[PDB]
Amino acid sequence: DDQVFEAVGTTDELSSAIGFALELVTEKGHTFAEELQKIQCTLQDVGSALATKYTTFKAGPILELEQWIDKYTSQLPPLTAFILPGGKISSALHFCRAVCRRAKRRVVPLVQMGETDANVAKFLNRLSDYLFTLARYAAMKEGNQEKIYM
Amino acid sequence: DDQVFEAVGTTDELSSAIGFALELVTEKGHTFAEELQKIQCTLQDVGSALATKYTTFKAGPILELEQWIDKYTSQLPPLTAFILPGGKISSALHFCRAVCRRAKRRVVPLVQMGETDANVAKFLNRLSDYLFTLARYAAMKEGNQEKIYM
Amino acid sequence: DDQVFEAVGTTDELSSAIGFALELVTEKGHTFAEELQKIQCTLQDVGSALATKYTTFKAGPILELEQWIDKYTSQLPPLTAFILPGGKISSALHFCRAVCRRAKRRVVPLVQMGETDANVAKFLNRLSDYLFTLARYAAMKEGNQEKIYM
Ligand code: B12
Ligand code: B12
Ligand code: B12
Ligand SMILES: C[C@H]1O[C@@H](n2cnc3c(N)ncnc32)[C@H](O)[C@@H]1O
Ligand SMILES: C[C@H]1O[C@@H](n2cnc3c(N)ncnc32)[C@H](O)[C@@H]1O
Ligand SMILES: C[C@H]1O[C@@H](n2cnc3c(N)ncnc32)[C@H](O)[C@@H]1O
Ligand SMILES: [K+]
Ligand SMILES: [Mg+2]
C-alpha cells in the first residue's frame, strides 16, 4: 500500500525533525532531552505497528505523554489565544509539532481501514499537544515572551 | 473535510518553519525580522479563512507583500537562471519557500471547490516570491555569492 | 498535472533542506560539502526531467552516488538495527533523508504513468541511502555514538 509508505515515511520525517530539535536542546542543556529521545523510541514502535489483523500498540506511551503534558502545562501561564510559533528550541519544536500533525493525518486512513491500531493515531494526537506545550515551556524557561496576534 | 486539515496543517507548518528562520534572522540582527513576524500574523488569518459561503480574505497583505518584493528585487543583481538554494538564513528561507509552495498546493482544491477566497492562494503565491527574493537579499547582504549551475 | 507540481515541489523542498544541511557542514569544515552541492545540481536536472514522451535522465549520477555510498559504508561499523536519527549535521541529514524519501514517493505516479524516466526514481532511492550513510559518517567523525533502541 502507498498509504503505508506515506504514513511510515512521515513518522520517519517526524523522528528526524525531533532529532534535530534534540541537538539544539542538548546544546543549551535543557533537561527534557531524554523525553524527546524516548519519543523517538516510541516512534520506532509506531513505524513497526504501521507496517505489518493489525499489530496491537499498547496505550502505555499515551499515558506517559499525558503525564508529561500535565507536568508542563501546570507550569505555564494561562493561554486562550493562538501564539506565533519563541527561541530556537521552541520554534524547532513548533516545526516538529506541525510535522507530527501531518504524520497523524497520514495515519488516519490506515486506522479507518482497520489496518493499524487506533492507539497509533491517539499517540500522535497527544504527541502534538506535548510538543506545543514543551515549546511554550522552553520559551518560558528562556525568558522569551509569548507573542499573541490580535 | 480532510482537505481543510491538510491545508491548515500546512500553513501551520509554514508559519513554524518561518518561526525558526526568524530565530536565525534576529541572531544576526537583520532588520527584516519584523516582516517575517507580520507574515506569521497573516498566516494566522489565512488559517482562520481556510476553516469556516467562504470567509473573505482581504487583498491588503498581498499588496503589502508586492511592495516588499519590489523593495528587495530592486536591490539584487539580474538573474535569468536557477540558483542552488547562500548562508544559514538564506537556506532556511529557501526551505520556508518550498514549504510555502506546498501550502499553496494544498489550498488549490479549496479555492476550486469555492470553499475559500481565491486571495488566500494569491497570497501564498506571492509569499513564495517574497521568500525567494528575501533569501537572495540575505545572501547578498552577507557577501555570499549566488551559485548558478550550468 | 497536479502530480508534476507535487513532484517538482518536493524535489525543490529536498534541495532546500540540503542547502541548510550544507551550511552546517561547511561551518564545521567537513570535506563532503561539495558532494552535497553536486547533488543539488543533479536535483535541478531532476526538476527539469520531471517537468517537460519523457526526458531521458542519464544514469551517471546514480553510479556516482553508488560510488560515494561504498566509500562511506566501508568506513562504518556494522549495523543490523534501526538507529535513532547524532549531532547537528547528522540529524539535519536524517531530516534531508526523510524529505528525500517523500520526494521519491511523489515521483512514483509519474514513472508509473510513463511521464518521467524511471532513473529519476532510482536516483532518489539511492540518494536516500547516501544521506543515511553520510549522516552515520558525520556522526562517527564527530565521536557521537550510534544510539540503537531495543
Ligand atoms: C482552524 C484551527 C486551527 C488551525 C489554524 C488556527 C489559525 N487560525 O491560525 C491550526 C491547525 C493551525 C490550529 C492549531 C492549533 N490549535 Co486549533 N483550532 C482551530 C479552530 C478549529 C478554529 C480557530 C479559528 O480560526 N478561529 C477563528 C479566529 C478568528 O478566532 P480567534 O479570535 O483567534 O479566537 C480563537 C482563540 O482564542 C482560540 N482559543 C481559545 N482558547 C485557546 C487556548 C489555546 C492554547 C489556543 C492555542 C487557542 C485558544 O479559540 C478561538 C478559536 O475559535 C479552533 C476551534 C473552533 N474555534 O471551532 C481550534 C482550537 C482553537 N485549536 C486548539 C488547539 C489545542 C490548537 C493547538 C495547540 C493544537 C496543537 N497541539 O498543535 C495548535 C495551536 C497553534 C498556535 N500557534 O497557537 C484548541 C484550543 C483550546 C484547547 N487548549 O483545547 C481549539 C479551541 C480546538 C479544540 N481543541 O477544542 N488550530
Ligand atoms: C519546472 C520549473 C521549476 C521547478 C524545477 C526547476 C528546476 N529545473 O530545478 C521548481 C518548482 C523547483 C521551480 C522553482 C522556481 N521557479 Co520555476 N519554472 C519551472 C519551469 C516550468 C521549467 C524550468 C526548466 O526546467 N527548464 C529547463 C532547464 C534545462 O532550462 P534552463 O537551462 O535551466 O533555463 C531556465 C532558466 O534560465 C529559467 N529562468 C529564466 N529567467 C529566470 C529568472 C529566475 C529568477 C529563475 C529562478 C529562473 C529563470 O528559464 C529557463 C526555464 O525554461 C519554468 C518555465 C518554463 N521554462 O516553461 C519556470 C520558471 C523558470 N520558474 C520561475 C521562477 C519564478 C521560479 C521560482 C523563483 C519560484 C519561487 N518563488 O519559488 C523558483 C526558483 C528556484 C531556484 N532555486 O532558483 C520563472 C523565472 C522567471 C521569473 N522571475 O518570472 C519561470 C520562467 C516561470 C514563470 N514564472 O514564468 N520552477
Ligand atoms: C517499515 C520499515 C521501515 C520504516 C519504519 C522502521 C521502524 N520500525 O521505525 C522506515 C520508513 C522509517 C524505514 C527506515 C529505513 N529503513 Co527500513 N524497513 C522497514 C521494514 C519494512 C520493517 C521494519 C520493522 O518494523 N521490523 C519490525 C521490528 C520490530 O523489527 P526489529 O526488531 O527492529 O528488527 C529490524 C532491524 O534489525 C532491521 N535491520 C536488519 N538489518 C539492518 C540494517 C540496517 C542499517 C537497518 C537500519 C535496519 C536493519 O531488520 C528488522 C526489520 O525486520 C524492513 C524490512 C522487513 N523487516 O520486512 C525494512 C528495512 C529494515 N529497512 C531498511 C533500511 C535500508 C532502511 C533505511 C536505512 C532506508 C533509508 N535510506 O532511509 C531507513 C533506516 C531508518 C533508521 N533510523 O535507522 C533495510 C535494512 C537492511 C539494509 N541495509 O538493506 C530493510 C531490511 C529493508 C530492505 N532494504 O531489505 N524502514
Ligand atoms: C486545532 C484545530 O486543528 C485542526 N486539526 C486537528 N487535528 C489536525 C491535524 N492532525 N492536522 C491538521 N489540522 C488538525 C482541527 O480543526 C482542530 O480543531
Ligand atoms: C516555477 C514553476 O514551478 C511550478 N509551480 C508553480 N506553483 C507551484 C507550487 N505551488 N508548487 C510547486 N510547483 C509550482 C510551475 O511549473 C512554475 O512554472
Ligand atoms: C525501509 C522500508 O521503508 C519503506 N520504504 C521504501 N521506500 C520508501 C519511501 N520512498 N518512503 C517511505 N517508506 C519507504 C519500505 O517498507 C522499506 O522496506
Ligand atoms: K506532504
Ligand atoms: Mg542551527
Residue numbers in the entry:
A (entry chain A), B (entry chain A), C (entry chain A): 79 to 130, 141 to 173, 175 to 239
Published text:
Human ATP:cob(I)alamin adenosyltransferase (ATR) is a mitochondrial enzyme that catalyzes an adenosyl transfer to cob(I)alamin, synthesizing 5′-deoxyadenosylcobalamin (AdoCbl) or coenzyme B12. ATR is also a chaperone that escorts AdoCbl, transferring it to methylmalonyl-CoA mutase, which is important in propionate metabolism. Mutations in ATR lead to methylmalonic aciduria type B, an inborn error of B12 metabolism. Human ATR is a homotrimer with active sites that are located at the subunit interfaces.
To gain structural insights into how the mutations impact AdoCbl binding, R190C and E193K ATR were cocrystallized with AdoCbl and PPPi, and the structures were solved by molecular replacement. Electron density that could be modeled as AdoCbl but not PPPi was present in the 1.8 Å structure of R190C and 2.2 Å structure of E193K ATR·AdoCbl. Both had four identical chains per asymmetric unit with an occupancy of one AdoCbl per monomer. Structural overlays revealed Cα RMSD values of 1.6 Å and 1 Å for WT ATR·ATP versus R190C·AdoCbl and E193K·AdoCbl, respectively, indicating that the mutations do not induce major conformational changes in the overall structure. AdoCbl was bound in the base-off conformation with Phe-170 positioned at a distance of 3.6 Å from the cobalt atom. An overlay of the WT and E193K ATR structures revealed only subtle differences in the orientation of the deoxyadenosyl moiety. Indeed, structural changes that might explain the profoundly lower affinity of E193K ATR for AdoCbl (±PPPi) were not obvious in the crystal structure. It is likely that the E193K mutation impacts protein dynamics by destabilizing the β−hairpin roof and, therefore, the active site architecture. Although Glu-193 makes a single electrostatic interaction with the amino group of the adenine moiety, it plays a role in stabilizing the β-hairpin roof over the active site via its interaction with Lys-78. Hence, the E193K mutation is predicted to primarily impair the chaperone function of ATR by weakening its affinity for PPPi and AdoCbl in the ternary product complex.
